[model samples]
Target: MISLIAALAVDRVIGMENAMPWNLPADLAWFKRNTLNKPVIMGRHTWESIGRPLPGRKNIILSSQPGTDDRVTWVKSVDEAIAACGDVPEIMVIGGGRVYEQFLPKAQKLYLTHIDAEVEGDTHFPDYEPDDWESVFSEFHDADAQNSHSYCFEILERR
Candidate 1:
């Protein structure tokens, strides 16, 4: 049961110049809430920019480029990770653009924090038709003094 998680603007953009353009501590909390104890898979470049593997979960890296670490389990394909994960109900696919694109089809659920505004970005979520997925849960969050922008968490399951 692989799932993809991302916080992106309404324009479908995820990052600009290899970094996220907005900050949301609540959104980060939202991420940790859903992914605690779940195995996490990400691309090589995503790992590089994030500095290190996240604490307290299995960090699985899918890479072809020149990066390796003893802390994370490295694999070449989704099938390999799937096999290694055994019967875990979920593996969180946290990413840069390429990792999300690759896992979208295989993902059973998508946890997306939908931003109301757009930020300039070179990296964006890959386009997919709305008909292909069905929404299971949604929550509206208005921007407040503690938060920078209004957003919603939309969880989708492939139909």
Candidate 2:
């Protein structure tokens, strides 16, 4: 199954200047642990934000532009990205705005960290009707506790 994992603010902002504005160490750890052995598909900008391929994972970067890297497999299309994943049971779609929109229709599940606050950002998540998905699980966190921000982790499935 194809899944999308990301963190966003109340206004649907995902990034400020091509990178996340907040620091959530716990969220980072969760992302690393969950996607460690999975095939991860992302846009070229997302890859640039990360600066390098994540260790111990198959990194597939989608871009029409030409590029080469041993740790990353560059693909020109979404179908190619999916094919590059081989027979992995699950594929993770990490993102920048355009990448998220391109893969949203193909995703079966969504794992999102919804922050309670809003901040200025250049990129935003696409808006979709609530009827388009079903929220299977969600857990809210306190602002001043484990992290400086209050957020909710939501697991949604396409209906």
Candidate 3:
């Protein structure tokens, strides 16, 4: 099934520049473990930010531009990415703004880290209403000395 994995701010801001504004080790580990061995689809900017293919996972980078990379299988559209994923039980659409918006309709599950804060950013999550999806599970992390950010992990399914 198609799933989206991302972390966003209170304003739905995802990135101020090209990188995440907050650092949460637990969240990063969770993402890495969950997406391991699955096919991950992302836009060019996301791939560039990441710099290389995540080991043990099949990397599929989407771009309108014609280009190729040994570390990643490139596709032109979200449909093509889905097709490339084949029967993989879980496929992750990890992204920058453009790719996220493109794959939102096709996604059955959403793994979102909702940071309890806001930031001015060039990239933001697409507008989605709570009525459009049901939250199946949630876990909140309290702000502490080590980590100043408070966030919640929400698992959502389309309604």
Pick by TM-score: which candidate is best? Answer: 2
lDDT of 2 at 152: 87
Off by over 4 Å in 1: none
Worst 10 residues of 1 by lDDT: 60-69
lDDT accuracy of residue 119 in candidate 1: 86
> What TM-score fits each model?
0.94, 0.94, 0.94
Q: Give the TM-score of candidate 2.
A: 0.94
Evaluated against the true structure, the overall lDDT of model 2 is: 0.88
Candidate 1 lDDT, tens digit per residue, 3-111? 9999989689998877786888889999999888888888887788788878888888888754467988888887886776768888899987998888888888899
Please estimate how well model 1 matches the true structure, expressed as its whole-model Cα lDDT. 0.86
Q: Which digits, one per residue and each the tens of the lDDT, describe model 3 over residues 1-159?
A: 889999888889999778887877778887997799999998999988988789999999898888667767988887888898889799999988998898898889999998888788899998877799999999999988766789899999999
Q: Whole-model Cα lDDT per candidate? A: 0.86, 0.88, 0.88
